[PDB]
Write an enzyme that holds these catalytic residues in place. Structure first.
Site, short mmCIF file in Angstrom:
data_model
loop_
_atom_site.label_atom_id
_atom_site.label_comp_id
_atom_site.label_asym_id
_atom_site.label_seq_id
_atom_site.Cartn_x
_atom_site.Cartn_y
_atom_site.Cartn_z
N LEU A 10 0.83 -1.20 0.00
CA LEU A 10 0.00 0.00 0.00
C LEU A 10 0.87 1.25 0.00
O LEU A 10 2.03 1.24 0.41
CB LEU A 10 -0.94 0.01 1.21
N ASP A 11 0.29 2.35 -0.48
CA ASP A 11 1.00 3.61 -0.55
C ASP A 11 1.30 4.15 0.84
O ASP A 11 0.53 3.95 1.79
CB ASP A 11 0.19 4.64 -1.34
N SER A 12 2.44 4.83 0.97
CA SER A 12 2.81 5.40 2.26
C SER A 12 1.80 6.45 2.71
O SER A 12 1.39 6.47 3.87
CB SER A 12 4.21 6.01 2.19
N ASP B 133 -1.22 6.52 1.95
CA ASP B 133 -2.47 5.85 2.31
C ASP B 133 -2.48 5.44 3.77
O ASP B 133 -3.55 5.32 4.37
CB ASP B 133 -2.68 4.63 1.41
#
Ligand SMILES: CCCCCCCCCCCCCCCCCC(=O)OC[C@H](COP(=O)([O-])OCC(O)COP(=O)([O-])OC[C@@H](COC(=O)CCCCCCCCCCCCCCCCC)OC(=O)CCCCCCCCCCCCCCCCC)OC(=O)CCCCCCCCCCCCCCCCC
Ligand SMILES: CCCCCCCCCCCCCCCCCC(=O)OC[C@H](COP(=O)(O)OCCN)OC(=O)CCCCCCCCCCCCCCCCC
Ligand SMILES: CCCCCCCCCCCCCCCCCC(=O)OC[C@H](COP(=O)(O)OCCN)OC(=O)CCCCCCCCCCCCCCCCC
Ligand SMILES: CCCCCCCCCCCCCCCCCC(=O)OC[C@H](COP(=O)(O)OCCN)OC(=O)CCCCCCCCCCCCCCCCC
Ligand SMILES: CCCCCCCCCCCCCCCCCC(=O)OC[C@H](COP(=O)(O)OCCN)OC(=O)CCCCCCCCCCCCCCCCC
Ligand SMILES: CCCCCCCCCCCCCCCCCC(=O)OC[C@H](COP(=O)(O)OCCN)OC(=O)CCCCCCCCCCCCCCCCC
Ligand SMILES: CCCCCCCCCCCCCCCCCC(=O)OC[C@H](COP(=O)(O)OCCN)OC(=O)CCCCCCCCCCCCCCCCC
Ligand SMILES: CCCCCCCCCCCCCCCCCC(=O)OC[C@H](COP(=O)(O)OCCN)OC(=O)CCCCCCCCCCCCCCCCC
Ligand SMILES: CCCCCCCCCCCC(=O)OC[C@H](COP(=O)(O)OCC[N+](C)(C)C)OC(=O)CCCCCCCCCCC
Ligand SMILES: *C(=O)CCCCCCCCCCCCC
Ligand SMILES: [Zn+2]
Lengths: 55, 55, 64, 171, 122, 55, 156, 88, 459, 128, 174
Positions: free
Chosen positions: H42-44, H46
């Site tokens: 997952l994106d940081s 996010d």
């Protein structure tokens, strides 16, 4: 007393137009209402100020 | 005043942006009275009380 | 029963003390209790002396 | 010191909160939160380190000029309406050593159980002291955080107050 | 008020000063000016303990109303008829003190015409 | 309750040998009473609930 | 029971002294700045930044959470004035200069308008409301002796 | 305070129930042990929204010095558990 | 007055002839009996004072100061039992001997009908007071404190000695009753200016007057608990009692000679109150509070009105119980943490719930909450100074604001907030500590019901 | 652009809008890392005693002792009578005293005349 | 009677006879009837019993009367024996005067409450007595100071008389 109350009933109400906290909003309402009472005493209607106090 | 309250109230529902103004911040921070007086007078009094009166 | 006791120890006893205090120690000294004299009106009888105050003159009033 | 990664992440955390306070309504928050989320994606691929800093110093300035004059605060945070509202109820634990027996007997299980922890600490303390001194530079400690339990039986050094801190809602 | 704009933004020597109300000569000008009658002369007013200001002319109206209140108790809703009578009498008294406003206002617009007539006679 | 005291004051204030600016402040303030009062109702009774899930 | 080698002392006038002073006060020799040697008695006490204790990380684990200090940290000369119950110096959303202009302007105009509204009152059209018996002379505390000049009001 | 105490099982159920309306994490892949950078990628940024989602679900706000350290739905239960004295 | 002098002397044999383990019990008990008998001094008449003999008399000014004095000795013995616990017996019985000898000089000082007999005992109080400070103080600064406390007083006392003797050669008698009938007016000449200062500067230093107060922060802070209690409760009132007497023979010169000392007091009142806002020592903060409060007494005495004298007497008694109580409260903290720094132990209301109630009651009287005698005395001085000059209300109103700020700041920095984590030896309040506070406040609060007994001769 | 934040003693410069954190110099990192060394060495000393179960009392804090010592006892031996100290003392000590003397002295002279002449209202004044 | 009626005069009362018009009752009358049954009578019995006991062993306390003594004006200079008695008597008279003023003030405040809204007219002689006595009180005891005495009071009096006689003497020359 008229002028003192007149500014108070305006300034505090103005501060209540953008306030968020519920108690703060009701707090500034009391200040505005208290200023309204001072206006009453400043126009030589002491009993109306007393009447506004109880109500 | 009541009508202007609801009409202004509904305007917040619109998905338009907002511009931080000066009156809004003036009303938000109680007119700045409890940000200068509550930060200046304590500094003036509590600094004189130490550097001049005591030391 | 809870209220009967409360109305006894907190109302009946204190009022007995106050009435006894007022009726035999306060009122026995001058001007400790001062009553604003009653508002008398025309067309009334004074319970103490039987005096009668003549009613007011005729009213030049109208309707509505 | 914070890292350049964290500073951007922090400014993102603040922006949504301050953005949320302006919007109030949840539906308008999503419509505007995404756009703010979008703007970070534009330079998310930036790899200059001299223009990312330049934008960050303009990112903070942009945030400051438009920051809310009364941001919402959760009512237990440093600025909320119930921050430290229960610190008067958070009595220490050493105060129970001063209790009178006439009232210590009121809880026979509690104080019999307490002696276990004091033993668990009085005997464990010397081991905890040894562990810290043997895992530290000769000059001295350089950071926070402490080594955990290495072997079995030994508890982490400096555990008593962390474990036994007053319950956050005493009453 | 509305005539205030006529005394602050407009002319000055037309409106009558509230603190300098008619100093013109006495009743002369209106033939056969009468005297307003008083019902509660001196002692009736100073027996109901009426407020120093209340007993202006309608004291008898007020005294009659206060008689009902002391009697109608605990029927406070009652005496509504008597209150209207006292209120109406003061309403007439208000217009009477309000006639003197226009009365002197017109007596001023008339007094300037003679002043201006003589000023422009030459 | 409030009309029998609040409104009587404004009637006496408007019809008295008063201060013009002070009178205007009182009337403007009365309008401000409705605006922040409507703020409490709208933001805490109408619309959709912004409060958390488990409450 | 601290000797006179771990307590404050006179001003340091040599590079060697400044080093010992920094070590004494638990400061980095580069971050140790003595107060100006103006003769007011500050001695070699570090001049820490005039930052309120409210301007400290409220989430960090302080030794003294209420005061936001670390045991052994040199204390500001005015620590008792900068505790959280007293003078605060946290950044404000509106610059200090701008706030004073607006607050001063609001109060200045308001007072002027009250003065303007005082010499230009706002009344209703009425007369000198009349009272009986020489303007309530006997009711208004007048002396019964030396009756006044007859004051009489006529109909209209 | 009339608010029922939070149970340890209740917290974890709430945590996943939060991480099942994201439209960015597969409902069938996320479990108690599911990284955001090493397992499900997952994106940081996010995480910040994920952390913000938790705060709006539990009230208390996590500091931005240990919230960053939490990318493990179970670990969010670990942190929330040791912020409300929940032991069972 | 022999009925109180002889019992006071017999306490010394009691202490020395008592059992080694009963010195505190016997002295405390019999000292309380002497205090009880002092209530007979209240046989006061509306026209004449209670004149016992050629040497001693007791009027409505001396009586309240006598009862406070004899009541304070039992309370000083309770307060001293802790730090005099590892002290050897002979020195413990010498410490009590000094306290008894100090009371003996004090009651005779407050009743001496002759102003030279008043002077000797007035100065005699310095010897035991100096011995208590320097021999049983805990710090190195106690030695310097005694020198300041000694030479400040003697620098002004010796001129008073010359002035008093000069008056006797002129009037013929220093007996106070005679002076009330033989007093002559004072002319306005340079010789009488220095006669005025000599008769007054001996008492200004002890009040103390602002400017001449540097000894008080050093003596009240380095002295043991018993020394501080008597120093601030009675020995400061020796200066006030002196002025109330000797101002009889200084009219009409007091009309203009008082101006420099009213500005030092009215302004110094604000300065010392301000100092308490920034003190880092709890005991030192209380010491500066006495200076602020005693500034009112100087003003009231120097304007010479029936209301000012009534307020001054009530203020002197009111401050005596309050100042002594505050020192006792501050010492209970010291006996645990053994440090006078105010910011070292906080949130004590969480560990000592009852001791915090005493702190509140002590602080409220300090800030003159009505209807306490603290307010009655201060209010009367404010009424009298208003007639003296309507502008003084600005200065005495500002002082009220500052007094409430530093009194509640003291109550908030120690009792509220967060408890100090590294302090773990805050044991519960002993019965001795609690009873010590209850004896200060109960009579202080009880005097409100019947306050005419502390309003002085002009009631 | 926007009006740049301007600092004041009562409103410090925000850390974000400060050209001092973003720059990462060799001396800064080896310094900011060095401050956290002593800031952690001292915590170790306190942490040891704070947890030692065989310890009852108060941990003497030299920083606290130094703070109070400089506020009270070390002021005079570091005081030199110079232009600043002398002028400040004169106008802070003598200024207010002289000012209030003329305020009250002027007023009481004014009242005395109105009373000696009889032109002052003291009709009901009998409490003084 | 308890208090003398010639010192604390009170005008005769006049309670208006009730003249109800409404058909509804008056709950005050019922409470008045209930009050003097559950409160007044039970209390009246206790006082009567206590009254009887006080009548069984009556004993008397007298009002001390002070023999007149020479005033300060008749005392030789520096004669403490004659001055002492003169001063004590002056102080006693000072206390009596301080209570005469309290009596007139007490009467003045009594009238204001009794007459209600008509106090500004009905209470006119009470104010006149109050103004006169305060003028007399202020002349004798005021500006003497905290250390007041007969001598200072005498000197103030002799100052007032000189001002009057000089004004009176120069009045005839107008
Ligand atoms: C004789 C008295 C014998 C003492 C017996 C005490 C006892 O055994 O009960 C235990 C009693 C209750 O036990 P507790 O539940 O454990 O509470 C103690 C804790 O420390 C917790 O204490 P707290 O924080 O709840 O404070 C209680 C205290 C103070 O609480 C307060 O409210 C703070 C004071 C604010 C009062 C401001 C009101 C204005 C006063 C003027 C109006 C009159 O209440 C009072 O002082 C009395 C109420 C005010 C009247 O203890 C106390 O209340 C405190 C100790 C007693 C102090 C007595 C002080 C008043 C004595 C006056 C007597 C002389 C008459 C004076 C007349 C003139 C008035 C000025
Ligand atoms: C008039 C004055 C009347 C009061 C007389 C003075 C009162 C003296 C104080 C009371 C006596 C006292 O101080 O208590 C001590 C005493 C008990 O002490 P004691 O028996 O000696 O205990 C150790 C024995 N090995 O107490 C008792 O023995 C009392 C039984
Ligand atoms: C009424 C108005 C009241 C006005 C009061 C004004 C102030 C009065 C004077 C206060 C004196 C303060 C205490 C004395 C100062 C002190 O504490 O000593 C400091 C200093 C140290 O010396 P020392 O202690 O001997 O050596 C170190 C040992 N560890 O000591 C010294 O080095 C020298 C000490 C000198 C001796 C003290 C003298 C006391 C003052 C009287 C001096 C004589 C007056 C002039 C005589 C005529 C003219 C010469
Ligand atoms: C700091 C520096 C302080 C400097 C203080 C200087 C004081 C010395 C100068 C004062 C001298 C006063 C004096 O000697 O008065 C003489 C006067 C003579 O009396 P007599 O003979 O009756 O005069 C009638 C003439 N037709 O005698 C009198 O009438 C009255 C005498 C009263 C006694 C005076 C005592 C000395 C005054 C000390 C002032 C207070 C100083 C306090 C600090 C200590 C110094
Ligand atoms: C740190 C030191 C603290 C201890 C300080 C001790 C006090 C200082 C010494 C004070 C000496 C007394 C002052 C008078 C000196 C002698 C001159 C004098 O007495 O003149 C009297 C003069 C009479 O003339 P007249 O004013 O016209 O009479 C009507 C007045 N109602 O009447 C007058 O002129 C009125 C009085 C004049 C005095 C003016 C004082 C103004 C300053 C007041 C603040 C004091 C500052 C002290 C400085 C300390 C450093
Ligand atoms: C800061 C400096 C403040 C002190 C300034 C002193 C000025 C004194 C003065 O000029 O008189 C002001 C005031 C006017 O009162 P007035 O009835 O007009 O009589 C004339 C008296 N000169 O004189 C007075 O009557 C005193 C009025 C006191 C008002 C107190 C207000 C307290 C505010 C808090
Ligand atoms: C209506 C009232 C509206 C407020 C008006 C009062 C404003 C007072 C004021 O602006 O002074 C504040 C002053 C600013 O100085 P500052 O910038 O903080 O210091 C230099 C830093 N470079 O900072 C200070 O406090 C200095 C003292 C000023 C005294 C006023
Ligand atoms: C009033 C006097 C006003 C004097 C102001 C100017 C004094 C001055 O400039 O020089 C004083 C002197 C310093 O010398 P300077 O040439 O200025 O340069 C430094 C050289 N070392 O410094 C000195 O060493 C001489 C001491 C100067 C005078 C000290 C006394 C006045 C100032 C202190 C006020 C005391 C306040 C007392 C308050 C009491 C009432 C509460
Ligand atoms: C008969 C007498 C007149 C009756 C009418 C009353 C007067 C007209 C104004 C009422 C409307 C109003 O002030 O609105 C109040 C609005 C409502 O908040 P918002 O910003 O819309 O929403 C808030 C949320 N946002 C920002 C995301 C959209 O707050 C403001 O604008 C802020 C400033 C209010 C005070 C401005 C007037 C004060 C002037 C004096 C010097 C400061
Ligand atoms: C006389 O003094 C009038 C005072 C009234 C002031 C309030 C005016 C409000 C007018 C608003 C415009 C309404 C037009 C119909
Ligand atoms: Zn100890």
């Amino acid at each position: 007393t008229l002028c003192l109350g007149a500014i108070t009933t305006l300034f505090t109400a103005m501060c209540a137009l953008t306030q968020n906290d519920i108690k703060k909003i009701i707090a500034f309402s009391t200040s505005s209402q208290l200023g309204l009472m001072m206006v009453t005493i400043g126009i030589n209607q002491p009993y109306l100020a007393f009447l506004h106090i109880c109500t | 005043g009541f009508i202007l309250a609801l009409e202004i109230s509904n305007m917040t529902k619109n998905l338009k942006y907002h511009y931080p103004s000066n009156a809004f911040k003036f009303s938000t921070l109680l007119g700045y009275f409890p940000t200068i007086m509550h930060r200046l007078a304590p500094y003036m009094n509590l600094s004189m009380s130490q550097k001049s009166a005591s030391s | 029963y809870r209220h009967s006791i409360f109305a006894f120890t907190h109302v009946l006893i204190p009022v007995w003390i106050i009435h006894y205090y007022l009726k035999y120690h306060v009122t026995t000294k001058p001007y400790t209790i001062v009553e604003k004299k009653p508002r008398i009106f025309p067309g009334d009888t004074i319970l103490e002396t039987g005096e009668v105050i003549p009613p007011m003159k005729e009213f030049p009033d109208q309707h509505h | 010191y914070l890292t350049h990664q964290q500073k951007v992440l922090r400014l993102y955390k603040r922006a949504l909160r301050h953005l949320e306070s302006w919007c109030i309504h949840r539906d308008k928050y999503r419509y505007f939160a995404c756009l703010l989320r979008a703007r970070f994606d534009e330079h998310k691929n930036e790899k200059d380190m001299v223009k990312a800093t330049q934008l960050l110093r303009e990112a903070e300035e942009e945030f400051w000029h438009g920051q809310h004059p009364q941001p919402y605060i959760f009512p237990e945070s440093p600025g909320g309406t119930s921050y430290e509202r229960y610190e008067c109820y958070k009595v220490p634990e050493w105060c129970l050593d001063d209790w009178h027996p006439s009232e210590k007997a009121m809880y026979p299980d509690y104080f019999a159980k307490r002696e276990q922890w004091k033993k668990l600490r009085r005997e464990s303390w010397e081991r905890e002291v040894k562990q810290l001194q043997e895992e530290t530079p000769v000059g001295g400690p350089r950071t926070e955080a402490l080594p955990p339990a290495r072997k079995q039986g030994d508890l982490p050094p400096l555990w008593w107050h962390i474990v036994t801190r007053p319950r956050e809602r005493p009453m | 008020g509305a005539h205030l704009a006529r005394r602050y933004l407009g002319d000055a020597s037309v409106e009558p000063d509230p603190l300098r109300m008619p100093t013109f000569p006495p009743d002369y000008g209106f033939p056969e000016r009468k005297e307003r009658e008083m019902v509660a002369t001196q002692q009736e007013m100073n027996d109901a303990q009426l407020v120093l200001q209340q007993r202006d002319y309608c004291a008898h109206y007020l005294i009659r109303f206060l008689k009902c209140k002391r009697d109608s108790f605990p029927n406070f809703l009652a005496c509504k008829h008597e209150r209207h009578d006292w209120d109406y009498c003061e309403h007439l008294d208000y217009v009477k003190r309000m006639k003197e406003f226009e009365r002197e206002r017109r007596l001023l617009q008339r007094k300037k015409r003679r002043e201006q007539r003589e000023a422009d006679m030459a | 309750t409030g009309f029998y005291s609040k409104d009587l004051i404004i009637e006496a204030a408007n019809t008295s040998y008063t201060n013009a600016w002070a009178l205007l402040m009182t009337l403007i303030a009365t309008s401000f009473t409705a605006i922040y009062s409507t703020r409490i109702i709208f933001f805490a009774l109408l619309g959709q609930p912004r409060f958390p899930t488990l409450v | 029971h601290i000797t006179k080698d771990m307590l404050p002392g006179p001003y340091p006038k040599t590079p060697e002294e400044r080093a010992a002073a920094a070590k004494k006060y638990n400061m980095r020799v580069e971050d140790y700045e003595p107060y100006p040697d103006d003769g007011t008695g500050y001695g070699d006490y570090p001049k820490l930044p005039d930052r309120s204790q409210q301007e400290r990380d409220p989430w960090y684990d302080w030794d003294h959470p209420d005061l936001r200090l670390n045991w052994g940290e040199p204390m500001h000369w005015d620590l008792d004035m900068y505790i959280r119950n007293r003078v605060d110096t946290s950044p404000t959303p509106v610059n200090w200069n701008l706030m004073c202009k607006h607050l001063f302007g609001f109060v200045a105009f308001m007072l002027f308008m009250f003065w303007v509204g005082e010499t230009y009152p706002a009344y209703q059209p009425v007369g000198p409301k009349q009272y009986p018996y020489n303007n309530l002379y006997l009711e208004r505390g007048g002396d019964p002796n030396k009756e006044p000049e007859p004051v009489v009001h006529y109909e209209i | 305070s009339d608010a029922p105490p939070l149970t340890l099982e209740g917290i974890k159920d709430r945590v996943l129930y939060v991480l099942k309306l994201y439209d960015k994490i597969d409902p069938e892949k996320l479990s108690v042990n599911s990284h955001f950078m090493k397992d499900l990628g997952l994106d940081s940024l996010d995480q910040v929204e994920i952390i913000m989602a938790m705060e709006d679900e539990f009230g208390f706000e996590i500091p931005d010095i240990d919230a960053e350290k939490l990318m493990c739905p179970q670990e969010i239960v670990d942190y929330i558990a040791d912020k409300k004295d929940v032991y069972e | 007055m022999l009925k109180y002098i002889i019992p006071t002397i017999m306490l010394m044999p009691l202490t020395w002839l008592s059992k080694n383990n009963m010195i505190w019990v016997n002295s405390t008990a019999h000292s309380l009996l002497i205090s009880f008998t002092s209530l007979l001094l209240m046989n006061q008449f509306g026209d004449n004072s209670l004149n016992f003999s050629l040497l001693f008399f007791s009027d409505s000014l001396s009586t309240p100061l006598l009862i406070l004095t004899m009541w304070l000795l039992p309370l000083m013995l309770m307060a001293s039992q802790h730090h005099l616990s590892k002290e050897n017996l002979t020195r413990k019985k010498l410490f009590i001997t000094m306290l008894i000898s100090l009371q003996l000089f004090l009651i005779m000082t407050f009743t001496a009908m002759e102003l030279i007999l008043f002077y000797i005992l007035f100065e005699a109080t310095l010897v035991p007071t100096l011995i208590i400070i320097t021999r049983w103080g805990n710090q190195t600064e106690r030695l310097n404190a005694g020198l300041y406390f000694l030479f400040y007083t003697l620098a002004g006392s010796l001129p008073l000695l010359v002035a008093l003797i000069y008056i006797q050669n002129t009037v013929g008698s220093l007996n106070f009753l005679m002076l009330q009938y033989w007093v002559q007016p004072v002319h306005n000449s340079w010789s009488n200016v220095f006669m005025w200062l000599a008769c007054m500067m001996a008492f200004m230093v002890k009040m103390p007057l602002y400017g001449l107060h540097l000894w008080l922060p050093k003596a009240h802070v380095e002295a043991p608990i018993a020394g501080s209690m008597v120093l601030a409760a009675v020995l400061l009132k020796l200066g006030g009692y002196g002025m109330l007497r000797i101002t009889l023979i200084l009219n009409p010169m007091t009309d203009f000679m008082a101006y420099p000392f009213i500005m030092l007091s009215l302004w110094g009142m604000i300065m010392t109150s301000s100092i308490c806002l920034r003190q880092t020592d709890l005991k030192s903060l209380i010491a500066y509070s006495s200076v602020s409060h005693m500034a009112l007494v100087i003003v009231a005495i120097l304007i010479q009105t029936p209301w000012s004298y009534m307020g001054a007497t009530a203020l002197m008694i009111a401050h005596g119980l309050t100042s002594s109580m505050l020192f006792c409260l501050a010492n209970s903290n010291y006996e645990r943490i053994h440090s006078r720094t105010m910011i070292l132990a906080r949130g004590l209301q969480t560990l000592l719930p009852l001791m915090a109630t005493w702190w509140l009651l002590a602080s409220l009287t300090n800030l003159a909450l009505p209807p306490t005698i603290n307010l009655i005395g201060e209010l009367f001085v404010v009424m009298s100074t208003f007639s003296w000059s309507n502008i003084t209300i600005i200065l005495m109103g500002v002082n009220m604001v500052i007094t409430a700020l530093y009194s509640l700041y003291m109550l908030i920095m120690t009792q509220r907030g967060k408890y100090t984590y590294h302090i773990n030896n805050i044991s519960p309040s002993f019965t001795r500590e609690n009873a010590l506070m209850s004896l200060h406040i109960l009579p202080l609060l009880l005097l409100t019901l019947n306050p005419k007994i502390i309003l002085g001769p002009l009631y | 652009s926007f009006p740049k934040y301007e600092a004041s003693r009562l409103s410090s410069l925000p850390t974000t809008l400060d050209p001092a954190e973003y720059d990462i110099s060799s001396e800064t990192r080896k310094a900011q890392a060095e401050r956290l060394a002593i800031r952690s060495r001292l915590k170790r000393e306190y942490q040891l005693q704070y947890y030692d179960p065989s310890r009852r009392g108060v941990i003497e804090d030299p920083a606290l002792v130094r703070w109070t010592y400089a506020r009270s006892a070390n002021i005079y031996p570091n005081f030199r009578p110079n232009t600043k100290t002398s002028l400040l003392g004169a106008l802070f000590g003598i200024g207010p005293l002289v000012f209030w003397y003329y305020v009250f002295k002027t007023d009481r002279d004014r009242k005395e005349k109105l009373i000696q002449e009889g032109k002052l209202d003291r009709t009901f004044n009998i409490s003084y | 009677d308890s208090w003398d009626k010639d010192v604390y005069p009170e005008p005769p009362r006049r309670t208006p006879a009730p003249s109800p018009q409404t058909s509804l009752p008056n709950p005050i009358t019922y409470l008045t009837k209930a009050f003097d049954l559950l409160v007044d009578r039970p209390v009246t019995l206790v006082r009567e019993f206590i009254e009887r006991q006080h009548a069984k062993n009556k004993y008397y306390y007298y009002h001390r009367e002070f023999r007149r003594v020479p005033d300060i004006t008749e005392c030789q200079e520096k004669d403490v024996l004659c001055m002492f008695e003169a001063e004590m008597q002056w102080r006693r008279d000072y206390k009596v005067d301080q209570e005469i003023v309290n009596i007139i003030q007490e009467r003045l405040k009594a009238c204001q409450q009794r007459e209600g809204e008509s106090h500004r007219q009905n209470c006119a002689k009470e104010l006149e007595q109050f103004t006169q006595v305060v003028k007399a009180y202020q002349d004798r005891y005021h500006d003497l100071g905290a250390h007041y005495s007969a001598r200072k009071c005498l000197a103030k009096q002799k100052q007032r008389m000189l001002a009057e006689r000089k004004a009176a003497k120069e009045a005839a020359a107008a």
